[PDB]
Structures are given as structure tokens and as C-alpha cells.
């Protein structure tokens, strides 16, 4: 058994500018023959891993020379010199000297960028899911950054708490941004006694929400 | 190039079996070792099994984790790796990966352990009460994944999909794409859900309300 270290996460790196992942082994990844068998994996948002770096410092084939890696037996550096949106991901080190092979834990790139308001989309209940007796109120918050955010659901006005469900995306891999989405699940009887649907964004780009409201 | 292509995930019972597989194309197959290695979000990429060369007697090798459950092989005359799995737990629920060390990896293939019944997605629109924002709500499925595109995947900007959150047993997801108000509605959006578990192919037209 090897224990590959590294950190889940990374200072938010602005575009343009240089990233710097580390990892670290619990036994000596320097053989014999003079290799250190160490290597880097990138895992894209909704990709598989893909081969980034071999034996410690080889590049593998089509990736960019802004790669590129360092290190003694048991510690070592990745360095990204001109960070790109595409390059955010899950870095993830391992080594080839033994069985089991084993990774680390991965760590992840954030690409930090300009402050950017969300885009919020209101969508009330299909005719489809109000025939079959239920009634989804649905908010998007797109293409926003930095990733944290609120949102808060009314009724006629008054604040409704419970019946939320919120997922959150990856960073994007184009646009550096994030997105919400926020869902109200009510029954269509429920949903019937009200007439007024509101969401609400709250982000650090404006001290007012971004209101989004609809009548039945 | 070389491509990867795994295969036979799905649901299955705790203490229950599945087999699946995997097919290598544009290397010399039986010239590689083989392995699997599985993704969750709690315990991270695991290797759990290899297998090496003919000339190797095909000797095998296992993770700890699942030794004794767990039965890799290969037919290199179809290009094939195999993964049977025996009294399958909950905890070995994940995607389940080929990979050539080093070098190469698949796509992927899903599976989850559980007592939980295969449910159908149901998909329903959602359209507005310079640009325009639609979507697609895909409700109360189990086991994931699900795939959703747009126009059969050919838009494929403006694109994202949301992860699914998993309440009382059954996923919800919906996925958003951002278009010009001059391709909506004059042209047509509709969005593809694949649920694989319960064999389900739902498009579903965006028309304006």
C-alpha cells in the first residue's frame, strides 16, 4: 500500500496566470532504473480521467507544454503556466512502483474571474405534471460567479421554506461561471390555493435580489 | 484512435450479481493489461482488479476491498475484459471504469446496489410564463444516471445540466439551455432523456405556453 496526498482544493487562479498542484507519497516513487513513477490525471467536469504527465515530468501526447511536472521520490509539482477556462477539473496523482495501484484524492482547479450577476428564469408548472396531480415551480440562476448565492421562494408574498430542492453546477468549463437551480414541488391541489409565484436571487453583485415572479 | 468502451451496468440487489464488460479498439488487445477502477463520491478512484497477459498465464489481482466477490477475465479473440461481481454491497456502487494502466480509460459504466425499485423518469417542459431560457424537468427516476440533450444532441451551446438531487428514494434533474428569441419558437427545441435502467427514450417538444 502507497498513500498519494493532496490537497481537494486550490487558491481560485486567475485566467492567464500560473496554477500550482501538489502531491506527496508515503513511500519513494524513484526506482532503480532512474524513473520516478509518478503520474497526473485530469478529469474534466462530466469527462473520464485522461493521462496528463508520465514517469513524473513527460507530457503525454497533445497536451499543451503550459503542463508540465517536477519532483524528488516523494514529493512533487504540477505547474499550469497560463491557466485556461478548459483547464478547470480534477487533478489526481498516482503512482506505478506496486499493486495495489493507488490514487490521491484530487484537487480540484478553480478559475477565478469577474464578478458576474446571475441570470434568473422562472418557470411555472407544466400541463403535463398538473395531469398527473403535481405542480414543480422551477427558478434558474445561470451563468453567475462567485459560486455562492441565495435563493428564496414566495407565495403570495410570504416567505416559503419547505418543498425546495437546489443543485448546484460545476464550474463551467468555457465560461468560468456557475449556476443554480432552484425547485418548488408542490401538489396540484396546493398549488391551486395560490396564485403568486416569486423566486428570489440573492448575490454579492447587487445589495437588492433579482426578483422573478409569475401569477397562476 | 484507441477507444475504450465499457458496458452491462444497471441496478442490482444487495447480495446480488452483475457482470459487466468492456471492448478495446484501435490497439492490439491482448498485448495490454487490463484493470477496473471504480469512482464514488466518497471513497474517491479505486483500482479493484487486473489482469495480465497470456503469456502471463493470465495471472489476476484484486483490491482487498472486494477480494473473494470479485472475478476479472478476458477474450482476447473479441477484444473483451470482464468484470464479474458477486454479493455485490451497497458500498460498491460507482461507475465502473477499464483502464489500460496506464494510459488509457473508458467511459464509464453505472452500477448501483440497492433495494430500491427502477423508475422511469417523467420529463416535462418548462417554457417561459435578445435571448430566451428553456428547459426540461426530469422527475422521480431511479437508479442514475439519466442523459439529456438538445435536438438530439446537436445544440449542444447555451447547454447545462443540473445535478440530481436524490429525495425518498427518486432523482429529480433539470437541464437549461439559453437560446436567441429568433431560433424560439419559430424553430423547434426539444429535449432527449435516456433513462437505460428502465429502457426509456422520452423527447419532449418545448412549445410556448
Known amino acids: 500500500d502507497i498513500v498519494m496526498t493532496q490537497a481537494a482544493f486550490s487558491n481560485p487562479v486567475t485566467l492567464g496566470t500560473s496554477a500550482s498542484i501538489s502531491c506527496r507519497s508515503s513511500?519513494?516513487?524513484?526506482?532503480?532504473?532512474?524513473?520516478?513513477?509518478l503520474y497526473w490525471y485530469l478529469q474534466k467536469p462530466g469527462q473520464s480521467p485522461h493521462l496528463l504527465i508520465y514517469?513524473?515530468?513527460n507530457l503525454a501526447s497533445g497536451v499543451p507544454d503550459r503542463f508540465s511536472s517536477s519532483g524528488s521520490g516523494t514529493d512533487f509539482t504540477l505547474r499550469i503556466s497560463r491557466v485556461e477556462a478548459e483547464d478547470v477539473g480534477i487533478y489526481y496523482c498516482?503512482?506505478?512502483?506496486?499493486?495495489?495501484?493507488?490514487f490521491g484524492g484530487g484537487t480540484k482547479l478553480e478559475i477565478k474571474r469577474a464578478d458576474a450577476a446571475p441570470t434568473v428564469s422562472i418557470f411555472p408548472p407544466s400541463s403535463e405534471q398538473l395531469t398527473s396531480g403535481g405542480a414543480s415551480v422551477v427558478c434558474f440562476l445561470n451563468n453567475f460567479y462567485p459560486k455562492d448565492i441565495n435563493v428564496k421562494w414566495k407565495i403570495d408574498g410570504s416567505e416559503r421554506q419547505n418543498g425546495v430542492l437546489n443543485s448546484w453546477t460545476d464550474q463551467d468549463s468555457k465560461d468560468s461561471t456557475y449556476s443554480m437551480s432552484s425547485t418548488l414541488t408542490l401538489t396540484k391541489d396546493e398549488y391551486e390555493r395560490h396564485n403568486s409565484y416569486t423566486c428570489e436571487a440573492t448575490h454579492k453583485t447587487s445589495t437588492s435580489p433579482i426578483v422573478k415572479s409569475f401569477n397562476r | 484512435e484507441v477507444k475504450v468502451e465499457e458496458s452491462g451496468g444497471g441496478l442490482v440487489q444487495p447480495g446480488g450479481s452483475m457482470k459487466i464488460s468492456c471492448v478495446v479498439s484501435?490497439?492490439?488487445?491482448?498485448?495490454?493489461?487490463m484493470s477496473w477502477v471504480r469512482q464514488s463520491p466518497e471513497k474517491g478512484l479505486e483500482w479493484v482488479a487486473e489482469?495480465?497477459?497470456?503469456?502471463?498465464?493470465?495471472?489476476?489481482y484484486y483490491a482487498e476491498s472486494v477480494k473473494g466477490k470479485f472475478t476479472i477475465s478476458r477474450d482476447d479473440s473479441k477484444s473483451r475484459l470482464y468484470l464479474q461481481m458477486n454479493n455485490l454491497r451497497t458500498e460498491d456502487t460507482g461507475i465502473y471504469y477499464c483502464?489500460?494502466?496506464?494510459?488509457?480509460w473508458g467511459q464509464g459504466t453505472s452500477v448501483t446496489v440497492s433495494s430500491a425499485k427502477t423508475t422511469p423518469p417523467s420529463v416535462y417542459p418548462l417554457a417561459p410564463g435578445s435571448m430566451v431560457t428553456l428547459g426540461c424537468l426530469v422527475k422521480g427516476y431511479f437508479p442514475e444516471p439519466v442523459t439529456v440533450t438538445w435536438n438530439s444532441g446537436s445544440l449542444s451551446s447555451g447547454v447545462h445540466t443540473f445535478p440530481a438531487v436524490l429525495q425518498s428514494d427518486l432523482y429529480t434533474l433539470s437541464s437549461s439551455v439559453t437560446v436567441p428569441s429568433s431560433t424560439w419558437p419559430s424553430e423547434t427545441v426539444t429535449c432527449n432523456v435516456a433513462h437505460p435502467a428502465s429502457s426509456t427514450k422520452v423527447d419532449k417538444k418545448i412549445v410556448p405556453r
Open positions: 498516482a503512482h506505478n512502483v506496486e499493486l495495489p495501484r493507488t
Open positions: 514517469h513524473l515530468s
Open positions: 483502464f489500460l494502466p496506464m494510459d488509457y
Open positions: 489482469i495480465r497477459l497470456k503469456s502471463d498465464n493470465y495471472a489476476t
Open positions: 484501435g490497439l492490439t488487445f491482448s498485448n495490454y493489461w
Open positions: 513511500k519513494s516513487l524513484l526506482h532503480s532504473d532512474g524513473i520516478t513513477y
